Amino acid sequence: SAKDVKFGADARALMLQGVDLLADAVAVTMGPKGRTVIIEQSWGSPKVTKDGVTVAKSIDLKDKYKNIGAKLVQDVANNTNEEAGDGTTTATVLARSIAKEGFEKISKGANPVEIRRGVMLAVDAVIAELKKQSKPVTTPEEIAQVATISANGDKEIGNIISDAMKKVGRKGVITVKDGKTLNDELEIIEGMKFDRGYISPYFINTSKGQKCEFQDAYVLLSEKKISSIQSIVPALEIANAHRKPLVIIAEDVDGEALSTLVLNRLKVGLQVVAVKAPGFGDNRKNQLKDMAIATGGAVFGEEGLTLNLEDVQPHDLGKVGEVIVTKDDAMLLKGKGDKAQIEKRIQEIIEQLDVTTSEYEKEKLNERLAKLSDGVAVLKVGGTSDVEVNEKKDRVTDALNATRAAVEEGIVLGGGCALLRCIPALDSLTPANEDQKIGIEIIKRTLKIPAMTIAKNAGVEGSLIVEKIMQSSSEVGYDAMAGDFVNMVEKGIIDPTKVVRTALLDAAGVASLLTTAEVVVTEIP
Amino acid sequence: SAKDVKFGADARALMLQGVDLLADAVAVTMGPKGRTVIIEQSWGSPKVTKDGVTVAKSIDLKDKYKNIGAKLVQDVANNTNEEAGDGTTTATVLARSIAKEGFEKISKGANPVEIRRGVMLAVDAVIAELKKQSKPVTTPEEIAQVATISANGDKEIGNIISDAMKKVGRKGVITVKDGKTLNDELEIIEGMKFDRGYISPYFINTSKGQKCEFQDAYVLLSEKKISSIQSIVPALEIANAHRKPLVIIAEDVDGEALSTLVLNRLKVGLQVVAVKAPGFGDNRKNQLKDMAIATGGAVFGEEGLTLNLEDVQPHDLGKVGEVIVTKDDAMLLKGKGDKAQIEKRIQEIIEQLDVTTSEYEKEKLNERLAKLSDGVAVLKVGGTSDVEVNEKKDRVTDALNATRAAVEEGIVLGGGCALLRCIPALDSLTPANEDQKIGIEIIKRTLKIPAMTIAKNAGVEGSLIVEKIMQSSSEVGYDAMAGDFVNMVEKGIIDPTKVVRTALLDAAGVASLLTTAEVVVTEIP
Amino acid sequence: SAKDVKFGADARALMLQGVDLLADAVAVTMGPKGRTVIIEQSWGSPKVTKDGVTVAKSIDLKDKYKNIGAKLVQDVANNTNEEAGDGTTTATVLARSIAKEGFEKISKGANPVEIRRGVMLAVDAVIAELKKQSKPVTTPEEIAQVATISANGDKEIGNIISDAMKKVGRKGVITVKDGKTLNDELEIIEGMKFDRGYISPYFINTSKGQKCEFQDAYVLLSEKKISSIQSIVPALEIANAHRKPLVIIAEDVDGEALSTLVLNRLKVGLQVVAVKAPGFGDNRKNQLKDMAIATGGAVFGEEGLTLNLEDVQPHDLGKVGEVIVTKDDAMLLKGKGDKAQIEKRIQEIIEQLDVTTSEYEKEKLNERLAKLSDGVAVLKVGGTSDVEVNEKKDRVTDALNATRAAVEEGIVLGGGCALLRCIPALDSLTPANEDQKIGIEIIKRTLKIPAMTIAKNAGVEGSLIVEKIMQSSSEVGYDAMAGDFVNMVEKGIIDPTKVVRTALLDAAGVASLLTTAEVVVTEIP
């Protein structure tokens, strides 16, 4: 198709006008004093939301250059940083600020490459200082405190979260379930969670949950790749005859088999899902064998054992309690099989760990062992009514994700004051040229933007607030909920340092991309 | 359809405005300091690329004359020069420069034919000087050094590349495969590669690979041409019975048979590919016999032996380990058959080489022998994860192609300084008329364009850099990565001379075409 | 449909504006220094061509009057003169020049019919002088020289061409074939070529060849016309049983039978073609009998012998080696049957020639005898690679056609100098009125136009070149390849007189038509 091509600033400026709107659409929905946005629904009543991620995912500009600039910011900000609600908003606002400053300085006649180098130097120095000043959370008391803080002060949520972390471990797997009671409880069961999400984006069992859900599902495991490979119908024979659903784990599925399964799920909606293998090579084979033993099945590789997908049998396949599949993550719960076989496999893994000496091999064997010997914690969140347990479950999931992010890398002052404590680290850096100095100045100016934005959302003048925070000590910041200079860490206004670091990294990357792009090609309307 | 016809400069000028955009779309993306280009995608997020070939293949102008000028540059530049990423970019930029200078000189009253004569004289002189100054690479340590240089300084990639080129030979066949391990390894197997690509451009099996992939496939060989010839269904009978795929090799396939196969591939996607024959006449018959012996099959020519496509049998056809098909190239790996038969065929080829005396016949028998006695090297590139092994495989393929191009025609200073050393050769040339002198001047001016463009991408002023390189010695050039005048050859900034020569040839050809065209006819909108 | 009608010059001028473009599109592609034309292909890369016939066949104007003028020139120029590449270009350029001069003189108040009479008188005088000036080609040395000259100095092509001509005859039948070897060879086989082309324009077996090709095909012959006559399916029964193709020769095929065969050709593409009978009446019957005896079949006329198309049998029809069908020409090779029957028929034809005395009857019997007693020469052109043998075959065909045209009517100076030697013959002609004198002047001015055009393509000033040629002797002209006044006949710059005469005749005819037309009626848009 015919294309229109724009060079130099005449393109970048256009792209900039496409991000400002997005920034202005999301900059207002950050901080505890976040305002509201009215999303228009073509079919029903307008939605009222105060979530940055939803607002960012909602808008879509009209002009091609503005649209591609907005999409460039959206994709990276939402995908790379998605754990926390402010994680994406901070990324978008910071990226807009850095891009605007860089474009304004470039228009004077500075070198874009040296400006980008100075920006990256300043960002690296800021991140180093942030890693230095990030205090860790490593005690059950501290874990409980951070869980309560991240749960808006709910004591029981923090208590059960800390209990789960203590029972399973910081490296353990925790999920939530409907309690069907008046008091949330904790359970530990046999589980198998790996980091391979669904292969079919259209494969979503639960429309509301953004997730795939099945229970008491049989499982087929084959080392060989089953992409575009037919004759899976024999499995579907018992999948329909026996009411239980089925999960197929392969190297990959694509082509004929994927098209047939996706069409049957779209039209008929049969209950068979498929995903990829967790490991690599011999590690993948061993992990598949471990999973088959944990489920009572067997790997259907043609090598060695004589077993293929051509014929299936009820006791040949494995039995698991329930299968959950989502983005980047999938899990099986309450597997079956011979428990003596489980003990033998665990002892074999233990002896392999003993005999092995390589660090990588020891780590892989440790992961394979801890997948089975350790269990999965399910948080049966309960309450009087379903519409109440749903909100409680959402709050529990939010608190659990926030506390896991906090324990992974530590905590820092919340409310946008985390970055305001890294400005002093910019004096140490020395620039080779003037353009790198200008990049340092740009990052120094943009470090204070989230605090100004939170203050503006709260209504107080941003400049006075940031000046007071900078001139004061390094322990107190500004609380917008109470609107005063308070001791953040004791008052319970903190954020995980992983979120802040990832937001700064994403903003720096996208700003560099938008300030170094030279040619934009867009399809003609 | 109604046509609009433009004569003289009023057409050429239009055509010129077509190429300038293309040049400006690719001139930025050359050099180690290459900027980025944002390709609009109608379905997803915009693509960010710094590859010259992709950017050139992306754009498509709207006006008919500009579009056809851009397509004229695109087709030749991409097709004739495709080995290296900078080859096509250099071709396009040089072609634009020469065409612009030629049009400007022609507009003042010069003779286009006597201008093109001078341009071609200067280009031939420059290429002669380049061939003179091209230092060769013919030692294993030199091959290792050039492989490491072309792999951005990766020592192990260079080591394994040199090991392959030593265990198979400089003129041998090397491919890459997934290692499924933590260390890249080398293997030598029985192979059969010939220079006939796929007959069906819509026969791309692996969508991501731009290639046709099959494993453990039977093979049918027939001397007679099987275009528009039905009754290939009997082969499809066992192709459906035995899940193995099948490859047909004929004189050509076209008409009814091609249409049936292409519709079955588009809709049903059966695993039967077809390709042409490698040889010619007696050579074709002997090569088909050699391939059948290497696979255990037989040529299905009706002459002599009584065998046709009407009836097939499982042991009548040959068996090969894997079939790889791509553009201009195809190969079969791990063939089968009687090894004593292979020995007898090799001995008969040796005796034919002994008895024969003609140079062409001796060369043909040498090629036929080396296609069987020698093996194919597969580089099992491995790593921790699928993405890591994919990126490593891409890097290995890039390094292998670059080092093969280097060994084929030597190496020369990279960074666009290769052509800057050929300007002195333009003093020897003497023009018969003034127009040939003006052509000499045009080529002299355009020789310094790639270096100026690389400097401009790096940000430094082009004129100062090229003047410094011209006035300095003949051993040092400009490094954009470090941004200083350094000794290129030991610093590891080199390019194969084949790429530079092909780029100059293509640019000269397309520039002559665009500066000598008189009538342009384009369909009415 | 509603029609717009234009009278007088207001129409002719419009038509003229539609031929100038065509002339300007083809005038640049003539002479050895022919420039290039960029045809726009709606589906792929633009085509670069330097063929006058292709450019003329490409363009198509938009305005109705201009379009019909261009089509008027195109149809006559291409259809009546298509043997040589310059044969059509010279026709179009000369026709445009004569039409323009005639219209300009008519606008002043001249009488169109007397102007046309003067133009025709001048053209006839020029053609008579040209036929006087022609040098015959009637010796094998001259045949070899002209074959080498027409093959751009290729010695082996000329040698094999002369061998074919002197082995078969001056008016013998020669075709080309793929040699499948490194050396072109000559073969003589039994053949039957007649001057009846394919009946169905859509019937084109070889898409690339502009020809119909079949091998080892049976043949049906019937004296009675088989237009719109069904029950030809009995022949198709064995045409499907035996994979051999089939050719029908009848009086004509039209209506139901033609429609059925053509729809099966586009849809199913069965290998049965049909053509018209060669002769007329008694001659047609005798020629069909000769063809049947040469193929072993029989004519299916119901008179006398009892045989019809209702039932067919394998030995009832004739067997021939291969059937070639093209425009205006069809031919069979390697017929079968009783060789003693062939001898008896030849002796019967000899005795009929002996007894007969009429000149026309003797000529017809001589043609019928020489069809069978003489053979057909096939030139197996060969080479290393298919893309090489294709170009070699094209060059061989071009040289063969050029040398046959040269031997048919002699040769004359090439490079457009042939017509410049006929200007002196215009002094002998005396016009009755002033308008015929003006027509003489018009033809005198237009005789020099091809020389001006060739010089302009070469870039040298046309007027100086033509003045030098006119003032010099009658043996030397201007060579554009070397750009100097050289002795054409020895240097090898000649063209057949047939091409020049036909081009002049066609140009005169079309110019008279475009300068005498009074009313133009064109459908409303």
Short mmCIF file of N, CA and C in Angstrom, two decimals, chain B residues 1-3 5 7 64 68 71-72 75 111-113 280 360 513 516-524, chain C residues 21 24-25 28 35-40 45-46 48 58-62 180 182 384-386 389 458:
data_model
loop_
_atom_site.label_atom_id
_atom_site.label_comp_id
_atom_site.label_asym_id
_atom_site.label_seq_id
_atom_site.Cartn_x
_atom_site.Cartn_y
_atom_site.Cartn_z
N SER B 1 -5.80 -0.74 -20.67
CA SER B 1 -6.17 0.39 -19.83
C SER B 1 -5.50 1.67 -20.32
N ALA B 2 -6.16 2.80 -20.10
CA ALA B 2 -5.62 4.08 -20.55
C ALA B 2 -4.29 4.37 -19.86
N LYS B 3 -3.33 4.85 -20.64
CA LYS B 3 -1.97 5.08 -20.16
C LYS B 3 -1.60 6.55 -20.31
N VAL B 5 1.78 8.91 -20.71
CA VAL B 5 3.15 8.76 -21.19
C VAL B 5 3.87 10.08 -21.02
N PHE B 7 7.70 12.09 -21.47
CA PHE B 7 8.94 12.07 -22.23
C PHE B 7 10.00 12.94 -21.57
N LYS B 64 2.55 7.44 -9.59
CA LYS B 64 2.95 6.31 -10.41
C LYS B 64 4.42 6.41 -10.83
N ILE B 68 7.33 3.92 -9.54
CA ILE B 68 8.08 3.04 -10.42
C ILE B 68 9.58 3.33 -10.34
N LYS B 71 10.62 1.57 -7.18
CA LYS B 71 10.62 0.13 -7.40
C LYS B 71 11.77 -0.30 -8.29
N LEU B 72 12.15 0.54 -9.25
CA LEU B 72 13.29 0.24 -10.10
C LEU B 72 14.56 0.12 -9.27
N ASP B 75 14.15 -3.19 -6.73
CA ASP B 75 14.24 -4.54 -7.27
C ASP B 75 15.70 -4.93 -7.47
N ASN B 111 25.46 15.20 -23.23
CA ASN B 111 24.95 14.05 -23.96
C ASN B 111 24.76 12.88 -23.01
N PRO B 112 23.54 12.36 -22.85
CA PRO B 112 23.34 11.24 -21.91
C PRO B 112 24.17 10.01 -22.23
N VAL B 113 24.34 9.68 -23.51
CA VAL B 113 25.10 8.48 -23.85
C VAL B 113 26.58 8.67 -23.56
N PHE B 280 22.20 -30.59 -16.36
CA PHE B 280 21.74 -30.30 -17.72
C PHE B 280 22.12 -31.46 -18.63
N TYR B 360 36.21 -28.67 -18.73
CA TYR B 360 34.82 -28.57 -18.29
C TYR B 360 34.30 -29.90 -17.77
N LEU B 513 20.47 3.42 -15.88
CA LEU B 513 19.10 3.21 -16.34
C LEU B 513 18.22 4.42 -16.07
N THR B 516 19.29 7.41 -18.38
CA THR B 516 19.16 7.24 -19.82
C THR B 516 17.74 6.96 -20.27
N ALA B 517 16.82 6.68 -19.35
CA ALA B 517 15.43 6.44 -19.73
C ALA B 517 14.82 7.69 -20.34
N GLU B 518 14.05 7.50 -21.40
CA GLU B 518 13.47 8.61 -22.14
C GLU B 518 11.95 8.66 -22.07
N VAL B 519 11.28 7.52 -22.12
CA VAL B 519 9.83 7.45 -22.14
C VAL B 519 9.36 6.60 -20.98
N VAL B 520 8.41 7.12 -20.20
CA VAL B 520 7.80 6.38 -19.11
C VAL B 520 6.31 6.31 -19.37
N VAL B 521 5.76 5.10 -19.39
CA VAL B 521 4.34 4.88 -19.59
C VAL B 521 3.77 4.25 -18.33
N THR B 522 2.72 4.86 -17.78
CA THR B 522 2.13 4.42 -16.52
C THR B 522 0.62 4.39 -16.64
N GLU B 523 0.00 3.37 -16.05
CA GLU B 523 -1.45 3.24 -16.10
C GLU B 523 -2.11 4.42 -15.40
N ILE B 524 -3.23 4.87 -15.96
CA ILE B 524 -4.00 5.97 -15.39
C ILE B 524 -4.56 5.49 -14.05
N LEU C 21 2.01 10.90 -29.94
CA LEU C 21 2.45 10.21 -28.74
C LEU C 21 2.99 8.83 -29.08
N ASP C 24 6.21 9.23 -30.71
CA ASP C 24 7.21 9.61 -29.73
C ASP C 24 7.51 8.48 -28.76
N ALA C 25 6.60 7.52 -28.62
CA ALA C 25 6.89 6.38 -27.76
C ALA C 25 7.75 5.35 -28.47
N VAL C 28 11.97 6.66 -30.30
CA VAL C 28 13.20 6.62 -29.52
C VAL C 28 13.81 5.23 -29.45
N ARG C 35 17.19 4.04 -27.25
CA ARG C 35 17.05 4.32 -25.83
C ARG C 35 16.09 3.31 -25.22
N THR C 36 15.72 3.52 -23.96
CA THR C 36 14.90 2.57 -23.23
C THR C 36 13.58 3.20 -22.83
N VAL C 37 12.58 2.34 -22.64
CA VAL C 37 11.24 2.73 -22.23
C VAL C 37 10.87 1.92 -21.00
N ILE C 38 10.27 2.58 -20.01
CA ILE C 38 9.91 1.97 -18.74
C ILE C 38 8.41 1.72 -18.77
N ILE C 39 8.02 0.50 -19.15
CA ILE C 39 6.62 0.12 -19.08
C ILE C 39 6.25 -0.15 -17.63
N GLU C 40 5.05 0.28 -17.23
CA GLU C 40 4.58 0.10 -15.87
C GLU C 40 3.75 -1.17 -15.80
N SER C 45 7.55 -5.32 -10.74
CA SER C 45 8.51 -4.28 -11.06
C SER C 45 8.30 -3.79 -12.50
N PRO C 46 8.58 -2.52 -12.76
CA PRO C 46 8.43 -2.01 -14.13
C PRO C 46 9.37 -2.72 -15.08
N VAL C 48 11.77 -2.83 -18.37
CA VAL C 48 12.66 -1.97 -19.14
C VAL C 48 12.82 -2.61 -20.50
N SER C 58 2.05 -1.55 -26.21
CA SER C 58 1.79 -1.27 -24.80
C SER C 58 0.82 -0.10 -24.63
N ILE C 59 1.08 1.03 -25.29
CA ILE C 59 0.36 2.25 -24.94
C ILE C 59 -1.09 2.16 -25.42
N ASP C 60 -1.94 2.95 -24.77
CA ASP C 60 -3.35 3.04 -25.13
C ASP C 60 -3.87 4.35 -24.57
N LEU C 61 -4.21 5.29 -25.46
CA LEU C 61 -4.62 6.62 -25.02
C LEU C 61 -5.99 6.57 -24.36
N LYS C 62 -6.38 7.71 -23.78
CA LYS C 62 -7.63 7.84 -23.04
C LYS C 62 -8.74 8.48 -23.87
N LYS C 180 20.35 -29.49 -25.69
CA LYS C 180 20.78 -30.30 -24.54
C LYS C 180 22.22 -30.75 -24.71
N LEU C 182 26.54 -28.88 -25.56
CA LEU C 182 27.39 -27.69 -25.58
C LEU C 182 27.62 -27.14 -26.97
N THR C 384 25.40 -24.57 -21.92
CA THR C 384 25.62 -25.09 -20.58
C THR C 384 24.36 -25.02 -19.72
N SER C 385 23.66 -23.89 -19.75
CA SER C 385 22.56 -23.64 -18.83
C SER C 385 21.30 -23.25 -19.59
N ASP C 386 20.16 -23.50 -18.95
CA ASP C 386 18.87 -23.27 -19.60
C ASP C 386 18.66 -21.79 -19.92
N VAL C 389 20.73 -21.26 -23.04
CA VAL C 389 20.19 -21.83 -24.27
C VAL C 389 18.95 -21.08 -24.71
N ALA C 458 21.28 8.40 -31.52
CA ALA C 458 22.71 8.37 -31.26
C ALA C 458 23.22 9.67 -30.65
#
